[PDB]
Write a protein that binds this ligand. Structure first.
Ligand SMILES: Nc1ncnc2c1ncn2[C@@H]1O[C@H](COP(=O)(O)OP(=O)(O)OP(=O)(O)O)[C@@H](O)[C@H]1O
Ligand SMILES: [Mg+2]
Lengths: 335, 94, 246, 233, 212, 134, 99, 198
DNA sequence: ATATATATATATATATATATATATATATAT
DNA sequence: ATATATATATATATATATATATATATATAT
């Protein structure tokens, strides 16, 4: 989203390790003090003046300073790479020792910075977790948590770089040695290099080309071209959507049966499906009988259980009307 | 030191992502994406996205705004980091 | 925020459907009808419109869901009629933009039951224009005819404010749809497309899809590159140590 | 390097566990059959915690395995996993693939689906021990959580003004009863999820829109006639 | 005895030809691909059974040749059973430049990873801009359209050399590459400290380089 | 050994006269759920009849083995298909056990309403039965 | 009908042909602790009332395993139901299943 | 180790030339007596040797041998142009029975050119040369040159044996049947070939 | 500027080898 | 006279390697 903000804005146009140690010590003192102040507790104003004004500004500024020191070291690494590159242009075989020293000092400096960084990373993390623990002492300390969540990453991030840079540099270093072991070993006097340069400059005075095997490619049969189906389909376009309505007769019947049956639950009277169904089906014509029975059963089985079902004695098929309708259910006793 | 609107916006986006980046490292694979997004927002196509992105990154590197490190495993085989001058220019507004 | 919605689904020259537009519901749209009505056909047409990847589309019966039937046919070809067919979605974006995405399907002549699919998108179409009419030309007495992609492009370009695009790859199609708030995930890689199709396919057949529950880790948890970088670093260290030992 | 690896895996696992545990509270006791709730169980695998510990503290003790010319790094990791924690009894899968699997942090967490079936507490959800409707509801819950996670992950790349569309399907809905379908409807509407359902009979007469399709043979071809339906008349 | 490998082929040559790596290596070699130290498996395979493969390939009237730098390749003879082809003059320019970059310490910071833009910049620095451009188009006089044409031609030649193994694109990037020792062949005309006109005749006699 | 078997010499296919079109090979992918289910039941009864015919000559002349099939999630079928299935089973004197979650109400035969409950801290299935309707 | 542990696999209706996924066959969890029975009653063409059945037991152990013992009964009176043979109507509220 | 008969076949002094011609896609018919006999004898092993390359050594029903690359072919593959298959089918048609009385096994470039013009549709001819062309001299000359080039390409494949001279007059081998269609009971070869070509 | 050829990666289905668990008949301790 | 341990056969399903088809990027050539 910041792109539009920038568009409307319309704007346009110290590597010493003793330092890092002293910022780390200052950070340790301030962080411990803030953590202890938070742990002691206080009112909203005390919480503010002890954990939001002192902590926030100081820790942000000094972590930014430490990051700035790391960036200055990055600049120094770049400068030493450039110095090595320029030196190898001027001495060739005689700069090998100079480059090895420069690599040695840079590696040692990087290792010492990593050591100084890890010299206080763990305890600072512990103090930050302590501040996290003490943060919950008030409900308005939400912002504190952000710092206690933010000031984490930076620190770890810093430490990460302290290793990552070395991981990069220890890599680059090797290449330089490889170069010395490969580029200059077979070109000790460099004469091959100048002669190649002049050949490039004056190549077309004797244009020559190398020979390479160019075996033939195995010609293959092209798969048949794919032809789609075209028929210009035509047909009647659909009319406006019609509509149909759902019959709620079964809903009315279910409401009737539930009202007629709730009395049994109210009085806890033993319900016998046989007699109830036989009585109730008489009120409807035969074709509807089934659609009644089902519904009634659906309403009846929600009301308690039948204790006889645990007796191991099967129930009989009681007739509930003429024409041959039957029902199998024990009396519903336990409501 | 010469930051047109597009270059400045790309730098500000880089700074924001670095601030929200976990471990404070930026591979060029994300720098190219950021430049594509900023150029899309600014609605200008002088050349292809890739060529413009490459030219801007190189210009900032030589203008002392970014530092490049060759790491093959990294997405794009390079890792970029804001330089002190770039940090200052970015936080001057932020 | 107001989430975008799928207004309607249009089916052209499909098996049984000549030009039918079902207006979808804000919450639930139900389709009923006896066996063989064509509901599954509508579902298949929708999903084809959503993920036109031909490798993924496989319309097995609800029975044998995920059980290899060895038919050798994905079932999509038999669901289309000869000639041109279309499957399109109108979506109201959270920006209240009506966008008509869609695909032109066409059977490939030959013994193989193979199909060709071409995606496309339309932006800025007036709300009064229905896709059913937009995709057909009224030829004869109440005897509308379907028109091909080139004719559709000519017709749309002649209109004002409507932007039509045709995609040469389903990747850009998915990218554009994601840009307009139609897809939750950005399907940059083919694996992402496979996972997306797996999700919708499991939904369509419903219930516990074996592949889903088997890869729940991949489906829920995000991928991390820091762990991969650390493992690669350890790999390089071990390789150097082995070199030295040898 | 091995120590740094183990550390980064541990941090990533902890972060993912916290994220998933926070997400779990996004479910509100769905009612499907005897299933009363769905949950995601994330737990660091002890069989892999031991491996992390060995990597972080005792890398050297097993160098004999690592520096063998016969074993690649993936195979070396697989053999080391075999060495300690030998009761897992992995199957016939080859060392190479199991090692490659070991190289992914997500594998280190058991990520399973639990259901509060009836009154038996939370039990691992196995398709072999769940009714059709229960499994369908559980699968829908899983899919909705997955789509929510996908939306959440893409919240950064997307613009602040767009919420992606949400839509799922369910064919042969007749397998679900009225209670299950009502629960599904309430879940989908609470999650602003659109649903397209199919069933031979109109199983949802009083919610959303409905259509009925009838196929007619007509002059040696077919036509589908679509009619809208309404709840009351 | 009969049914015995030594009757027809030496044991080690047969073992080499039955190894899983033989087919890919043979197809690449016949395609014209050079083999450097980077392809550890293939390079070791060639080293172990180097003699068997020279004598096998001799049957095709082509010499499997290992340059002193340690990279193997195939040189067809005038009577080659496998066709033969010669690189373009622009290919020579890019190969000589690539050798320079391999030996150039100024670009050491790149750590071997180079972009086509840097290669073109170095090429124009050391070569004659307009007179080199003459080959790209006969009617060029510094027009920027022809400039882009030359850039595209350089990119195409770089891709072909990648096919020849002189350069490797990075596992994920086709816009960046790493040089290989094979490029040293582009300097075979200057590796010996003698008169250029005698070394050219020696090479052409050996079949190393034809003229244009 | 494959050639030694006469059955291998035969090619067997399942064909359906689908709609206006002629007889087409029964492909699971080219049919709807109900059509596939019905064709499956048809082939199953074919198999049962073939097995009975084969086994008759080794059985008592007055023995007719029982025939009984299942159909779970029968709700996937419409009323017309269910009626056709009932007609087929009756014509073949074949017993059916069909499960449907209350969606369908087949009027002919026995119906068993089931409801799950908790009683004495134990899961119990209350069961009710009906029959004879029609 | 088919008391074989190898073949009995009560996978869910969904995934009707899909792989196991898990190792359980789904039968053990459908039983209850103790001795259980599953019996069919059949009337032959000869009109012999035959009660076929199987006794099931959840094999106590580390895994979820089931033991099945088949059995057949012939010559039973038509007036006695299967539930009566297998259950004792003790004076308690609920009957007792006998081994 | 290696199969013994495979070692014998590879060691045979004929193997280098035959291998080069196969990897070049050439089809070995009955005319090449020595090569055809060698392939007949040692097919059981050369099939495995060339399957190691993810390629298939196929003996056609007519008898001629060739190499078919799979998708995973280790031999750099290539695809013939549309004009190449069209010309191949033209020659397959010209491998006719009246051909014996027509040209006695020796054809000339003019025969192929006239057959291609008269028989093929105009749209495909334009697609070959260029779409915007319409019956012009320069376009026809370019078409003739491309016809000669594709004839040379087929010669490379062994489909067409040139009669030795700069002039374009050649003979057609049986391997051309690859372009031909399947033969059914009672089908006229002429009719099926023309139906395929149309 | 765009049609077309080429190399690479992924998903999907086939076919084969193999370990696991169960069923059946026999051997041998109780 | 019995029940448990063994050997045999079988189906299950698990995993690997193969081969196919589709999408993609993109580098060439008119
Ligand atoms: N690929 C195909 N080839 C041939 N016929 C097909 C194909 N796909 C569907 N049909 C037929 O089209 C009609 C509709 O099929 P479809 O599966 O869409 O129906 P449905 O409404 O989902 O059915 P059901 O609810 O019974 O599953 C049926 O006759 C089906 O046989
Ligand atoms: Mg259906």
């Amino acid at each position: 989203e910041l792109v539009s903000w920038a568009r409307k804005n319309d704007f346009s146009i110290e590597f010493s390790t003793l330092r890092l140690s002293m910022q780390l010590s200052i950070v340790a003192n301030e962080l411990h003090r803030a953590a202890e102040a938070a742990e002691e507790g206080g009112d909203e104003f005390h919480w503010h003046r002890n954990v939001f004004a002192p902590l926030k500004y100081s820790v942000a500024e000094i972590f930014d300073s430490i990051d700035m020191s790391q960036r200055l070291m990055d600049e120094q690494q770049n400068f030493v790479k450039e110095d090595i590159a320029a030196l190898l242009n001027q001495d060739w075989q005689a700069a090998i020792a100079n480059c090895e020293q420069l690599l040695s000092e840079t590696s040692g400096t990087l290792r010492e910075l990593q050591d100084t960084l890890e010299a206080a990373g763990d305890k600072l993390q512990a103090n930050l977790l302590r501040i996290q623990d003490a943060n919950m002492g008030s409900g308005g300390s939400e912002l504190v948590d952000k710092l206690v969540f933010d000031l984490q990453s930076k620190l770890d991030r810093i430490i990460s770089w302290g290793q990552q840079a070395i991981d990069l540099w220890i890599g680059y270093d090797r290449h330089v040695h490889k170069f010395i072991r490969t580029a200059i070993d077979m070109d000790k006097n460099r004469i091959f290099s100048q002669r190649l340069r002049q050949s490039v400059q004056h190549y077309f005075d004797n244009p020559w080309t190398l020979t390479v095997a160019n075996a033939e490619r195995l010609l293959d049969m092209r798969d048949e071209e794919l032809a789609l189906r075209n028929e210009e389909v035509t047909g009647e376009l659909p009319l406006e959507l019609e509509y149909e309505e759902f019959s709620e007769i079964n809903d009315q019947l279910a409401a009737m049966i539930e009202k007629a049956l709730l009395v049994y639950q109210q009085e806890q009277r033993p319900l016998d499906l046989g007699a109830v169904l036989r009585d109730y089906l008489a009120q409807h014509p035969l074709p509807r009988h089934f659609d009644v029975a089902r519904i009634l059963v659906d309403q009846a089985v929600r009301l308690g259980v039948a204790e006889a079902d645990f007796s191991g004695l099967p129930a009989e098929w009681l007739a509930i009307n003429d024409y041959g309708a039957k029902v199998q259910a024990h009396v519903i006793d336990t409501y | 030191i010469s930051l047109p609107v597009e270059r400045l916006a790309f730098l500000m986006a880089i700074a924001v992502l670095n601030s929200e980046r976990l471990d404070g490292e930026m591979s060029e694979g994300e720098l190219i994406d950021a430049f594509r997004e900023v150029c899309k927002g600014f609605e200008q196509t002088a050349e292809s996205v890739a060529v413009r992105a490459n030219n801007a990154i190189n210009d900032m590197v030589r203008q002392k705004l970014l530092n490049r490190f060759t790491s093959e495993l990294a997405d794009g085989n390079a890792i970029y980091r804001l330089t002190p001058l770039g940090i200052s220019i970015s936080d001057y507004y932020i | 925020i107001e989430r975008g919605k799928f207004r309607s689904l249009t089916l052209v020259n499909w098996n049984g459907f000549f030009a039918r537009t079902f207006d979808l519901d804000e919450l639930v749209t139900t389709l009923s009808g006896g066996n063989g009505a064509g509901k599954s056909t509508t579902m298949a047409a929708f999903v084809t419109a959503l993920i036109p990847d031909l490798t993924l589309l496989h319309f097995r019966n609800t029975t044998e869901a995920g059980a290899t039937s060895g038919s050798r046919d994905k079932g999509l070809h038999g669901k289309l009629r000869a000639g041109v067919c279309y499957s399109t979605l109108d979506v109201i974006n959270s920006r209240h933009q009506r966008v008509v995405v869609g695909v032109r399907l066409q059977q490939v002549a030959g013994r193989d039951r193979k199909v060709d699919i071409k995606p496309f998108m339309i932006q800025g179409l007036p709300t009064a224009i229905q896709p059913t009419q937009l995709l057909t030309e009224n030829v004869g007495e109440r005897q509308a005819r379907v028109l091909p992609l080139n004719e559709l492009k000519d017709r749309l370009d002649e209109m004002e404010g409507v932007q039509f695009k045709q995609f040469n790859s389903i990747t850009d199609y998915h990218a554009q749809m994601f840009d307009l708030g139609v897809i939750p995930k950005r399907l940059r890689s083919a694996s992402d497309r496979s996972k997306f199709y797996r999700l919708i396919e499991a939904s369509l057949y419903g219930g516990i899809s074996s592949a889903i529950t088997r890869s729940l880790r991949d489906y829920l948890l995000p991928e991390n590159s820091g762990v991969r970088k650390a493992f690669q670093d350890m790999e390089a260290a071990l390789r150097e140590n082995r070199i030295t030992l040898e | 390097s091995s120590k740094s690896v183990a550390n980064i895996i541990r941090k990533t696992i902890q972060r993912e566990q916290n994220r998933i545990r926070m997400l779990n509270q996004g479910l509100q006791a769905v009612s499907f059959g005897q299933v009363r709730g769905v949950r995601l169980n994330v737990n660091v695998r002890e069989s892999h915690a031991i491996l992390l510990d060995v990597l972080s503290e005792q890398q050297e003790q097993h160098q004999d395995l690592f520096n063998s010319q016969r074993l690649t790094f993936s195979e070396a990791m697989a053999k080391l996993y075999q060495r300690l924690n030998p009761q897992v009894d992995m199957g016939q899968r080859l060392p190479q693939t199991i090692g490659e699997e070991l190289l992914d942090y997500r594998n280190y967490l058991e990520l399973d689906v639990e259901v509060n079936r009836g009154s038996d507490g939370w039990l691992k959800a196995e398709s072999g021990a769940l009714s059709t409707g229960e499994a369908i509801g559980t699968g829908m819950s899983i899919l909705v959580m997955v789509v929510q996670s996908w939306e959440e992950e893409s919240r950064r790349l997307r613009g602040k003004d767009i919420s992606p569309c949400r839509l799922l399907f369910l064919d042969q809905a007749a397998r679900l009863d009225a209670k299950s379908i009502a629960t599904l409807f309430e879940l989908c509407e609470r999650l602003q999820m659109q649903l397209i359902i199919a069933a031979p009979e109109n199983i949802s007469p009083e919610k959303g829109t409905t259509y009925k399709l009838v196929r007619k043979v007509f002059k040696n071809h077919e036509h589908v006639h679509v009619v809208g339906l309404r709840g009351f008349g | 005895s009969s049914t015995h490998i030594e009757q027809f082929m030496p044991v080690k040559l047969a073992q080499a030809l039955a190894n899983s790596l033989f087919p890919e290596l043979d197809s690449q070699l016949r395609a014209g691909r050079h083999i450097g130290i980077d392809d550890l498996d293939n390079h070791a395979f060639l080293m172990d059974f180097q003699e068997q493969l020279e004598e096998f390939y001799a049957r095709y009237n082509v010499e499997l040749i290992r340059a002193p730098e340690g990279f193997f390749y195939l040189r067809p003879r005038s009577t080659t059973l496998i066709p033969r082809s010669v690189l373009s003059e622009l290919d020579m320019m890019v190969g000589k430049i690539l050798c320079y970059l391999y030996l150039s310490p100024e670009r050491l910071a790149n750590q071997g990873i180079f972009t086509s833009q840097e290669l073109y910049e170095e090429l124009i620095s050391l070569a004659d801009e307009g007179k080199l451009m003459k080959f790209v188009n006969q009617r060029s006089s510094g027009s920027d359209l022809d400039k882009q044409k030359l850039q595209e031609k350089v990119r195409t030649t770089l891709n072909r050399l990648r096919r020849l193994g002189m350069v490797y694109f990075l596992p994920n990037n086709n816009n960046k590459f790493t040089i290989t020792e094979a490029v040293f062949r582009f300097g075979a005309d200057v590796r010996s400290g003698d008169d250029p006109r005698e070394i050219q005749l020696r090479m052409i006699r050996d079949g190393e380089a034809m003229p244009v």
